[PDB]
Nucleic acid binder design. Structure first.
Ligand SMILES: [Cl-]
Ligand SMILES: [Cl-]
Ligand SMILES: [Cl-]
Ligand SMILES: [Cl-]
Ligand SMILES: [Mn+2]
Ligand SMILES: [Mn+2]
Ligand SMILES: [Mn+2]
Ligand SMILES: [Mn+2]
Ligand SMILES: [Mn+2]
Ligand SMILES: [Mn+2]
Ligand SMILES: [Mn+2]
Ligand SMILES: [Mn+2]
Ligand SMILES: [Mn+2]
Ligand SMILES: [Mn+2]
Ligand SMILES: [Mn+2]
Ligand SMILES: [Mn+2]
Ligand SMILES: [Mn+2]
Ligand SMILES: [Mn+2]
Ligand SMILES: [Mn+2]
Ligand SMILES: [Mn+2]
Ligand SMILES: [Mn+2]
Ligand SMILES: [Mn+2]
Ligand SMILES: [Mn+2]
Ligand SMILES: [Mn+2]
Lengths: 84, 97, 106, 94, 96, 78, 106, 93
DNA sequence: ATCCATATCCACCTGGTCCTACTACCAAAAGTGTATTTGGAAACTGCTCCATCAAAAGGCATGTTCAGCTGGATTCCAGCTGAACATGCCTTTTGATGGAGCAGTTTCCAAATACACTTTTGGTAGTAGGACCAGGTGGATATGGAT
DNA sequence: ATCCATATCCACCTGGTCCTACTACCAAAAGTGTATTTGGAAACTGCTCCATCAAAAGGCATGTTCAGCTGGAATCCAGCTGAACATGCCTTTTGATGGAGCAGTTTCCAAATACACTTTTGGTAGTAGGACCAGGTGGATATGGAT
């Protein structure tokens, strides 16, 4: 195991550009990308937490797709396609 | 020089607005997930479908956010989305407050 | 004779009953509640499967994929409002460009 | 191996009724499963709250109906209430 | 005259931000509620607490919508709220 | 009726919301928004009243309706 | 002998929240410790809201709490404001906040 | 009809908190609505918890996890310590 | 800077809407004693699938150049909208009367539960075999945009 | 309006994915039949509180005038951001493996349920006492703003 660091920069400028395109965005300022990462960090942090809170309650060490579905649902962004 | 600034952008809007593929590379997103989760609790494992679910939710949320943001930019008589647009959107939808 | 046939339904009345009491929504569950609920669920599935099948026919496809379910949901105002806070995996987005972003005057 | 029940059989029947020459993908069928389970939980939850508000211990077809009217939008609510009423009258007619 | 435009406007922003009283006259709001309810069921009567509750929730909703609306007007480098600001707020919120 | 909610009242509501200057077209848009809000809430509340086999809309019907609309209200029961 | 809330050192009724957990159709069985825990948490949150509301009351030169004081307490505390982010306190009003670009002198 | 409420208990906690302060009737009703609201939230989250794991009992563990899922950070930690403390005293009683 | 005209605030005062104390009653809530049932924790381990490695390769990220045009700054002015009056409409109130109907009570039965047997079936797994579509090609057509 | 560098569209095609199809089995599900229990509909009706007047009082909405200052249009231009390119890297893909850990199965007891019975208490209801504070008054002084 190697320490995991600075993986938010793995969300690349081209990827954020594609996500913005799917959003119908035409012109993107240079300061958007970092901003996006920030927002993205707040999103995952809030779902993953709840996810592992389920995983830890079931005395499990493996996060299931169902834990993600329950966390997303309790966050109000319920997701179809992965069970439940 | 062949295409005026903006044409290829509209072409890309049609391309990605027509398809459903994920737009963030899979492995870097997986590393990000394992980092965020590793900071909450060590020695965690993931089902592959859990990471793919986090992928789907994240990209859907970000796409919708980019739509509301684009509306924020256009509301200011701008074609260019800017951090103030994202902050206005997230503030209106009670995500930041 | 099953209760589904007894009610003229394809959806399982017995399963909806057992699920209604298994999820402790109340102490007791009347005999008509799973019939009515299975009927409603069956109607909703029929509606979305109709609109989605049309979505697949429009794209010259014979097998419904999530893209067709998304096209059906987000183009029907009522289904879109019903699933307003739901995201369909691999559903994509509706083609929509804000008019101001289009070119004009050469 | 514990059995994992689903609505896929019934979704497939109602699929061959509406579009007889149209199949459905594994993913799309999964989305349909999540849709049926979701709407199920919404209806039965609103009906649970309904019975509790009125201090009844039984969930009848009537609570399911009021829950449908509270949950589904306009036309979907009307047609759903229609099909439900038809189904329970046909059921009790036997 | 005396005060320049926008001064007593600020004065009333402070005045009504300090207080908690309801801002729509009771009787017209009650008439509105009864008219709107008449379309869904006839010969309906209301507990006074139900009407007052509807007014609390309504005026709270409108005050918040004017917060987000004012923010929308300021985003476009303006001070006057305009219908397109209310529309933008309601669309971002997920109401429109 | 909907015009009975006057422009001065809408102004006071906007001032509590911290608004300094108001367009002349704001008042109609506001009356429409308020009417939609009351239409949804009152619709659900009257659904609750009818289910209870009653003819008097109670404060608890408004409270339940508001709660399921995602706008819970403290101070009127529940 | 002695009430369960007294044995738990609580002011909130353990027996009542136990009975309510039973009648609320939350689960088929309710352990003996769950009402103790829940009653304790409710008592703590009540203590927090009443504490901050009391501070607002003394700051407003008053001795008994009004809805305005509850609103000031909730909306000035970040975590209580997040917990009550979707609830409306009747007769609470709003916090004094004027956008800076609306102040005099441009 | 016996109309139950959290009024007397909330008032007693108020006396433990601010012994010289009172509370109005409408503020008291707001407090009651708040206690009922948090009750329904924690109990519902706990019910969903026990259902997700195919369990038939709501234990103090379910209530705790629901508290971690509902309350913000510091409020969650404080509420958790209060709960485990009350359960510890109730057990050794 | 001078100072006129309001707005604003602090000290004080008092009626009254409104809060706590005290007494009485009682259904129901809560506790306790005890006897039965059972959810689910422990222990064991089958079996899924997760982490990890290896290697090959090309899709796509990175970093750079160049300039088209967009945002932002500036200026200006037509015209909306705020601020103050003058009316006088119609909410507010409060006092009180019908009486609608909410809500408490008692009956009583259609329906729901509990239990036991029997039949059906939907789901899993093993094995085997079609077909819809993704990706690739090649040419015809369509489009942006320079001229 | 003509001509070119590119993108787009389509028919055709094929790999190998995605889906479907039988056979087999069975544990769980579902249906059927009797017996027992009971939730809650129905009928009655007491009393809470809701609708409706009556009827001044004057609070506040409405119409109007004037002009301040704001929104939006018109210009200019720096430098930000899009487009294209050359390079090469690290993600994607295919296949394999050990073993962690999820999950199936059986045992067994602490802990919950079920009931009887006693005790306690919180809620309702009068009747009565009290007091925090909203609203008003004087008078000081800070403030928006015109000279
Ligand atoms: Cl910005
Ligand atoms: Cl029924
Ligand atoms: Cl507008
Ligand atoms: Cl417990
Ligand atoms: Mn870390
Ligand atoms: Mn006095
Ligand atoms: Mn067992
Ligand atoms: Mn490189
Ligand atoms: Mn421009
Ligand atoms: Mn009557
Ligand atoms: Mn079969
Ligand atoms: Mn193709
Ligand atoms: Mn052309
Ligand atoms: Mn072939
Ligand atoms: Mn009974
Ligand atoms: Mn002028
Ligand atoms: Mn300006
Ligand atoms: Mn230049
Ligand atoms: Mn290489
Ligand atoms: Mn092992
Ligand atoms: Mn007592
Ligand atoms: Mn007195
Ligand atoms: Mn005062
Ligand atoms: Mn001055």
């Amino acid at each position: 195991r190697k320490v995991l660091r600075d993986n938010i920069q793995g969300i690349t400028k081209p990827a954020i550009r594609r996500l913005a395109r799917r959003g119908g965005v035409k012109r993107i300022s240079g300061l958007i990308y970092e901003e996006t990462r920030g927002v993205l960090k707040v999103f995952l942090e809030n779902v993953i937490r709840d996810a592992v809170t389920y995983t830890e309650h079931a005395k499990r060490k493996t996060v299931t797709a169902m834990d993600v579905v329950y966390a997303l649902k309790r966050q109000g962004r319920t997701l179809y396609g992965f069970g439940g | 020089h062949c295409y005026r600034p903006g044409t290829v952008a509209l072409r890309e809007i049609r391309r990605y607005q027509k398809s459903t593929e994920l737009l963030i590379r899979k492995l870097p997103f997986q590393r990000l997930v394992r980092e965020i989760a590793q900071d909450f609790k060590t020695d965690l494992r993931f089902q592959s479908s859990a990471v793919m679910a986090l992928q789907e939710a994240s990209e859907a949320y970000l796409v919708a956010l980019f739509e509301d943001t684009n509306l924020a930019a256009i509301h200011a008589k701008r074609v260019t989305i800017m951090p103030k647009d994202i902050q206005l959107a997230r503030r209106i939808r009670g995500e930041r407050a | 004779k099953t209760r589904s046939s007894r009610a003229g339904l394809q959806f399982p009345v017995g399963r909806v009953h057992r699920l209604l009491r298994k999820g402790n929504y109340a102490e007791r569950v009347g005999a008509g509640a799973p019939v009515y609920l299975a009927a409603v669920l069956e109607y909703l599935t029929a509606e979305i499967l109709e609109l989605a099948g049309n979505a697949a026919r429009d794209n010259k496809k014979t097998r419904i994929i999530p893209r067709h379910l998304q096209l059906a949901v987000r183009n029907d105002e009522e289904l879109n409002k019903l699933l307003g806070r739901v995201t369909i995996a691999q559903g994509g987005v509706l083609p929509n460009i804000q008019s101001v972003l289009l070119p004009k005057k050469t | 191996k514990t059995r994992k029940e689903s609505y896929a059989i019934y979704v497939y029947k109602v699929l061959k009724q509406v579009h007889p020459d149209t199949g459905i993908s594994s993913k799309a069928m999964s989305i349909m499963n999540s849709f049926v389970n979701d709407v199920f939980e919404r209806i039965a939850g609103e009906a649970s709250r309904l019975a509790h508000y009125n201090k009844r211990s039984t969930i009848t077809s009537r609570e399911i109906q009021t829950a449908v009217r509270l949950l589904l939008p306009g036309e979907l609510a009307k047609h759903a209430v229609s099909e439900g009423t038809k189904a329970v009258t046909k059921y009790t007619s036997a």
